[PDB]
Amino acid sequence: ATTLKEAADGAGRDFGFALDPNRLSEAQYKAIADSEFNLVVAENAMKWDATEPSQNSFSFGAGDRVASYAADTGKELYGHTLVWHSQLPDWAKNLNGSAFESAMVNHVTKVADHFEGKVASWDVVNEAFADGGGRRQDSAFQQKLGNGYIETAFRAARAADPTAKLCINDYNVEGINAKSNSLYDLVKDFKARGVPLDCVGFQSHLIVGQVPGDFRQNLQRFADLGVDVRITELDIRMRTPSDATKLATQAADYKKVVQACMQVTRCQGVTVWGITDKYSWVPDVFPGEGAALVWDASYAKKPAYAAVMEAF
């Protein structure tokens, strides 16, 4: 194996990255995207704010570019994300009751339909739970619609796209904890009542030297509920600047994650949230933290690269 792509290919799994369409005009970026991955997800192009800036007015330009890139290079296409509390336009946050419900169902239907046949799987609902257990405490959907909005989104997504793999996504649920437990209950419930649900996405936004020791176990119990599992937004945050020691630990961590997936027959694969640290979303969100991706700002393979290659 000379690329992470064929390594993942040989393991019968996916290895993807979060794409910023604008960067495709950057040669080195495209070269890596083209050769090191077999799956692609829109880092931002398919979110609510990007697809429905104004009520009932859709903007699929950016999303279509991402979709075209996938079809053009023969990569699987992953959809992110239909229902999410973040990056939600104000016009939506201003709606309530029936109006809001209607706008949510409409958003799901229009976006799902638009990419039908192209997007193979969707993070239908993202980040619905709260660290420590229970539902997220700062979500427009949870506050305006209560517990039933999740099921409604999945049913509406299934209605718009009969065959797409419908997933629920979250972070800090990689290991067994109060958050993953609540997520687990929801999944068990949905499968029990026949609610459309086919997968669970573990964002996996981890911190170096802090990969959950029960990652595999946790992935396995979810898979045993009768749904596929996948690492969808992998990146391992470290205190900057980076140094040999922290880069080595990070490498060991990436190995652990990919290995956990490899040890679960239902783990479809791993998707890293970006290619290079030059564009990683971490620094601006986590002050003093960064250097979380496989390639550095100069597009040089970091120790994590060889670790992933080995894990696969």
Q: According to the binding rule CB under 6 A, does residue 233 interact with ligand XIL?
A: yes
List the catalytic residue out of 76, 233, 289, 310.
233
Question: Binding to ligand XIL by residue 281, rule CB under 6 A?
Answer: yes
The token duo for 99 is 């109006």
Min separation Cβ 244 and ligand XIL, Å: 27
**Burial classification of residue 101, based on how many CB atoms lie within 10 Å of its CB (0-12 exposed, 13-18 middle, 19 or more buried):** middle
Identify residues 20-59 at the interface with ligand XIL (CB under 6 A).
43-44
Applying CB under 6 A, does 126 fall inside the site for ligand XIL? yes
- Rounded to 5 degrees, φ, ψ at 184 are -60, -45
Strand partners, 229: 200, 267
Q: Looking at beta carbons only, is 9 or 26 nearer to ligand XIL? A: 26
- Residue closer to ligand XIL, measured from CB, 69 or 273: 273
- Give the three-state DSSP class for 113: helix
Tokens of 28: 């080195």
- The answer to whether residue 36 is catalytic is no
232 burial class (0-12, 13-18, 19+ CB within 10 angstroms)? buried
Give whole-number Cα distances, 228 to 189, 222, 264, in Å: 16, 8, 10
Residue 233 among the catalytic residues = yes
Q: Of the two residues 7 and 211, which places its CB atom closer to ligand XIL in the complex?
A: 211
Asked if 139 interacts with ligand XIL (CB under 6 A), we say: no
Burial of residue 173 (CB within 10 Å: 0-12, 13-18, 19+) is buried
203 binds ligand XIL (CB under 6 A): yes
Terminal Cα distance for the chain, rounded: 10
In this complex, which beta carbon is closest to ligand XIL, that of residue 87 or of residue 163?
Answer: 87
Tokens, residue 87: 């990056």
CA dist., res. 227 & res. 237, Å (int): 28
Q: Which residue is nearest to ligand XIL (CB)?
A: 281
Least distance CB 6 / ligand XIL (angstroms): 27
CB of 126 to ligand XIL, least distance (A): 5
**Minimum distance from residue 51 beta carbon to ligand XIL (Å):** 13
198 binds ligand XIL (CB under 6 A): no
Please give the size of the binding site for ligand XIL, defined by CB under 6 A. Answer: 6
Alpha carbon 142 to its chain centroid, in Å, reads: 20
Q: Assess 277 for contact with ligand XIL (CB under 6 A).
A: no
Residue from 36, 43, 52, 127 carrying the catalytic annotation: 127
Nearest in space to 16 (alpha carbons), one of 288, 308, 242: 308
- Specify the DSSP element, H or E, that contains 215: helix 215-223
Nearer Cβ to ligand XIL (48/215): 48
Residues involved in catalysis: 127, 233
Chain contacts with ligand XIL (rule: CB under 6 A)? 43-44, 126, 203, 233, 281
